[PDB]
Paper text:
LsTktA crystallizes in the trigonal space group P3221 with a protomer in the asymmetric unit. Overall, apo-monomer dimerization buries an interface area of 3998 Å2 of each subunit with the formation of 16 salt bridges, 60 hydrogen bonds and numerous hydrophobic interactions predominantly involving residues from the first two domains of each monomer (residues 1–528). Two peaks corresponding to molar masses (MWs) of 138.8 (±0.8) and 70.4 (±2.4) kDa were observed for the apo protein, corresponding closely to the theoretical dimeric and monomeric MWs calculated from the amino-acid sequence of the histidine-tagged Tkt, which consists of 680 amino acids. The peak distribution indicated approximately 75% dimeric and 25% monomeric species in solution. Other changes involve small shifts in the loop 190–198, which is clearly resolved in both structures. This differs from the structure of S. cerevisiae Tkt, where two flexible loops (region 185–198 and 383–393) could not be modelled owing to an absence of electron density in the apo structure. In comparison to the apo structure, 48 of the 54 superpositions had a global r.m.s.d. of less than 2 Å, with the largest r.m.s.d.s (∼7 Å) observed for the human Tkt structures. The two structures are globally very similar, with some slight side-chain rearrangements triggered by cofactor binding.
Author numbering:
A (entry chain A), B (entry chain A): 1 to 662
The structure:
């Protein structure tokens, strides 16, 4: 099974990682040193990948380093395995423009499946990848045609297991019985500040068992043979996901091994030498020994090529027997969308009154028949958010084809799962909760943005118009929270047509997440054509009603406040004041337009402006100008009837009119 | 033990709650109906409180309804118990300005210990309350003087237990062996969307046991006697916190009992009648029966008065035997602070170079001797944040007097615990993590703000200057995230004197949380006096260097960018341009100043302005104006040496100078 060359492999990982860190004079040597043994066994015997085709083989096993600080080990693996990470790349760890950055960045480095610096999120994404494999397998697989059949692995440490979000992900994964998911827990009794037993002395195996996982202990984590065995039993147990606790010694080889001092700093030239002693390692820095290159070739590369070719062959047969199906399987992965979205989506007449959450629910159902790769759910708020895909089944172990995911009351875990689902490929995902609770998943939105994933977030109950549930349930600052996240687009639709148009844009946008911000209360339909609303929303902002002749002023608004501005336009047309009304459903989309376009919507030279949005005024001075007035809410709300809360916080016609006139 | 009158009590809670909800035509009747039995047993036999003194008795048992949607039960209890919640108040549930709002609001209603609409946070705050009781008891208690000796209870449901943050809190509570903490779990198999088994089928008892809690099952949750017994065993087990799982039927009495339909909506007049049938209840709406009033008086009120008086008597003896101690015990609760803070805190000379995280560490240690009620810790980042209180001990079961809390990698649980610590009273708490991970605890900051708690958040590693760790670890949008939260103050100190001044302000501010945003890299000391910096920081913004005569322009900056602006002032004084330099360490504090003061710092009439901050430009147009230029970063950062990242994202002198001149 395992012989002496293999140990020289383990130690090649150790040394590369440590040399990389030492040359950068920056990085985290402890995990590489304690976890090379486990990573070696996995990558050489148990990872079904083919580096020769980079990350394009859709049925490769997926590996995630959730303990993202172990990056130097991941790169050393990617290099040994044959990905486009060269020795020179390892020598540029943490250097400007390198493909070997401080924490792993998906899209930056060949072989890196996920961006994982932030703790907890790596494993919770892996859970999403595993849900996707299960979903797709059940939808597409057939007698003799295992088209979506693979494992999901996550390497995790104590930090991951302390984070709430990894609890939410593990509970959800246990309930969904994701038997193809396996976690390798590098259990070394050390976190950054010191002994883990200063804060974390819980029984991890038992918790995991309480979730419906399988727990396996490997007491000797430098025993390659035992790790292999544990992974084999993890695989045989396909009714349950499995966590393998692997007892290791952090910083193995340093005088400081087993202490916090090896967690987050280079060893220094002395400590690198001392570890090389203990390893009986005599090679110069940044050398791979020949027998190690050859063992990886043997174990990993050649096996990978043959499994991909046997999958390509099996696949060509699939596509001939089950033609229409395999075409959908391909369209899933390539994100094909129909040209008729504009016709498929619901349209609203000038008399319609509908809440944007309900108009979103109607888009979802109209879309589900035509975009067959679309699935999603709510964080135990499908009935409140309105995010049931009617008659399309529930995603459960006995029905992995069901398209309605029941995330439970797990906002952050939901978001991270959606990231994994999208890293996996093959579907379009959406997830809903209340906008005020976007604070709970904000760090995952951040990761959607970094990783450029077109996750769709459906955030309902968007303002103090929520009413009786009171301040904790009434958003104020959450638009500012999400608009500021780079590489996102936030749409706050003003009626049902804007809401349909926002969903179309969300389907057509493939390199950033789209966030839809939706009302609880009914809103009137804007008095202009479908054609113009769709154009305007595709552009992020547009004129809803111009001035007959020369404009006295301009009202710029979003969401539910656009109807308010339309009313204030009427009241003001009396008093002798003819104002423009602009809807600005997305700041980000609006600013990506030409200066020419933007000038047509907000006249650079017109200076009597009012901005109106039920949320903080922070940021609005940009459109309001030195001379403008900002109507907004910069205080917590209250528990009262909707109309009273709005009136009292100044989201009224009378207030907008008075403020424009004073 | 329990007799027929008691059951009529249980049913008074049920009916009041349901009438309250029905009249409001808004609210959540399911939990009240299924959990009155448990709440009755607790409040009448096991809650050591005295309503006659409201919430002023510092050693009362603390009760938290974590399932905040059960508010109508909480108010019915507060009313029956004798708090200032009248029958008329119950008739104004969810009505404007009522003291009976939709979800419970601390500070709004007599008898309400915590604001708990957002799920997970109620129990995690309770954990903090329990840590405070343990801390204070160990510090102050003596032979025959149990001055801080009481229980902490939390009533929780399935939603709480799905949330990550309640896992972080339960793990931490298990590790700290908080034996005075008891949770009552209303386990009814139902969440909002449907059966809990659609998403949540884990073994809660076993997880809780894996944390180091005691688990007790009460299979018949309408058996008053069994609940009582379980609470008695929970109390006898003082080595471990205890969760009591109480199997109930949600909406008991409705045709719809045991379904999701009773979770979040009124029953309707029909269903209220049908529940009253099942209860054999013949009274008119909003009636308390006489024997019930008398049983509460008997069980709860009179016992409460005698326990408080016996504590007052025991206390007067304490204060005479242990005088200096009991004076500190009182100063703790009243938030007394010395007048010499300004002298105690570290001061920096014009040559000093220090990172604001390190200057904060020095303030912490200088403060700890003089403010004896100050304790705190880090989310497994004490060594990175710099939040070790030197030589003041660790907070652990064998040393509950230790003042350094090891929260582990539990940002959100840390924050919520700090809220509970502050609701409890008796200390000043601070907690640290990396600023980029404030996203993880943002919902708890929100609750500090709502509840007006002067929690201190120490957020380090504030910008892309972090460098090699790369984008996931480099804040961009997080200042916008926190500045927009109503009722907070965010300070981004520009040197060590501003950092000392910010800590003083944080101690003196008692009605909102203070957030300190701190640098990783060293910053130079600002070239002006201690006196002027302290004045300026107390004011939120101020002039650092004026123009010799007439100003050509103004540079307004924060944090580390103030030193940059000072350099650009030198380079610009050449080219014939004399500019003002303003430091704006806190927007919120600055805007609370008079218009007169603000005009002296930022001249209303001067229009050549540049704002400079290493983070998003969103919001800055307010100070920059129509004609100004905003220097900021609106993209994710990169993994590279600190100085290169700053240069490339334009946080340089050369860029500020060119931009001011073009």
């Amino acid at each position: 099974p395992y012989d002496q060359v293999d140990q020289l492999g383990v130690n090649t990982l150790r040394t590369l990682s440590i040399d990389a860190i030492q040359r950068a004079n920056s990085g985290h040597p402890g995990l590489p040193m304690g976890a090379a043994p486990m990573a070696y066994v996995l990558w050489t015997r148990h990872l079904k990948i083919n580096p020769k085709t980079h990350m394009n083989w859709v049925n490769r096993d997926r590996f995630v380093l959730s303990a993202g600080h172990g990056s130097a080990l991941l790169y050393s693996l990617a290099h040994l395995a044959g990905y486009d990470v060269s020795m020179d790349d390892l020598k540029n760890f943490r250097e400007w423009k390198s493909n070997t950055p401080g924490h792993p960045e998906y899209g930056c480095t060949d072989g890196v499946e996920a961006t994982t610096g932030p703790l907890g999120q790596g494993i919770s994404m892996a859970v999403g990848m595993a849900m996707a494999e299960a979903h797709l397998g059940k939808k597409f697989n057939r007698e003799g045609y295992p088209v979506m059949d693979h494992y999901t692995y996550a390497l995790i440490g104590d930090g991951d297991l302390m984070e709430g979000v990894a609890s939410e992900a593990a509970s959800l994964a246990g309930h969904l019985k994701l038997g193809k998911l396996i976690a390798l827990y590098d259990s070394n009794g050390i976190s950054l500040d010191g002994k883990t037993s200063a804060s974390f002395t819980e029984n991890v195996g038992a918790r995991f068992e309480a979730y419906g996982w399988q727990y396996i202990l490997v007491e000797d984590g430098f025993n390659l043979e035992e790790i292999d065995k544990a992974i084999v039993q993890a695989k045989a147990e396909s009714d349950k996901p499995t966590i393998i606790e692997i007892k290791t010694t952090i910083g193995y080889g340093s005088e400081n091994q087993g202490t916090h001092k090896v967690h987050g700093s280079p060893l220094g030239e002395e400590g690198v030498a001392h570890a090389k002693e203990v390893y009986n390692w005599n090679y110069p820095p940044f050398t791979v020994p020949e027998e190690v290159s050859q063992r990886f070739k043997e174990c990993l590369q050649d096996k990978g090529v043959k499994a991909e070719n046997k999958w390509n062959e099996m696949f060509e047969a699939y596509k001939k027997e089950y033609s229409d199906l395999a075409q959908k399987f391909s369209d899933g992965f390539s994100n094909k969308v129909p040209n008729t979205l504009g016709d498929i989506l619901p349209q609203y007449g000038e008399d319609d009154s509908i809440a944007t959450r309900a108009a979103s629910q109607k888009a979802i159902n109209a879309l589900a028949k035509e975009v067959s790769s679309l699935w999603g759910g709510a964080a135990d708020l499908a009935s409140s958010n309105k995010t049931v895909i009617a008659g399309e089944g529930d995603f459960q172990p006995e029905s992995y084809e069901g398209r309605n995911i029941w995330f439970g009351v797990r906002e952050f875990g939901m978001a991270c799962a959606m990231n994994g689902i999208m890293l996996h490929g093959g579907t379009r995902i959406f997830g809903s909760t209340f906008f005020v609770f976007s604070d709970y998943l904000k760090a995952a939105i951040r990761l959607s943005a970094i990783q450029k994933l077109p996750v769709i977030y459906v955030l309902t109950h968007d303002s103090v118009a929520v009413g009786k549930d009171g301040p904790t349930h009434e958003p104020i600052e959450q638009l500012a929270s999400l608009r500021t996240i780079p590489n996102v687009q936030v749409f706050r639709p003003a009626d049902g047509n804007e809401t349909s148009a926002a969903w179309k844009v969300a389907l057509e946008t493939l390199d950033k997440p789209t966030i839809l911000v939706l009302s609880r209360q009914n809103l009137d339909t804007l008095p202009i054509s479908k054609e113009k609303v769709f154009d305007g929303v595709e552009k992020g902002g547009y004129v809803v009603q111009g001035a007959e002749n020369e404009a006295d002023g301009i009202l710029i608004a979003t969401g539910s406040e656009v109807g308010l501005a339309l009313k204030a336009k009427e009241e003001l047309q009396k008093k002798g004041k003819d104002v423009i009304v602009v809807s600005l459903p997305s700041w980000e989309r609006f600013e990506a337009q030409s200066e020419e376009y933007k000038n047509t919507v907000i006249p650079p030279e017109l200076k009597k402006r009012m901005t109106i949005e039920a949320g903080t005024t922070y940021g609005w001075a940009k459109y309001a100008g030195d001379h403008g007035v900002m109507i907004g809410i910069d205080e917590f709300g209250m528990s009262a009837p909707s109309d009273i809360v709005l009136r009292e916080l100044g989201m009224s016609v009378e207030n907008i009119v008075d403020k424009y006139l004073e």
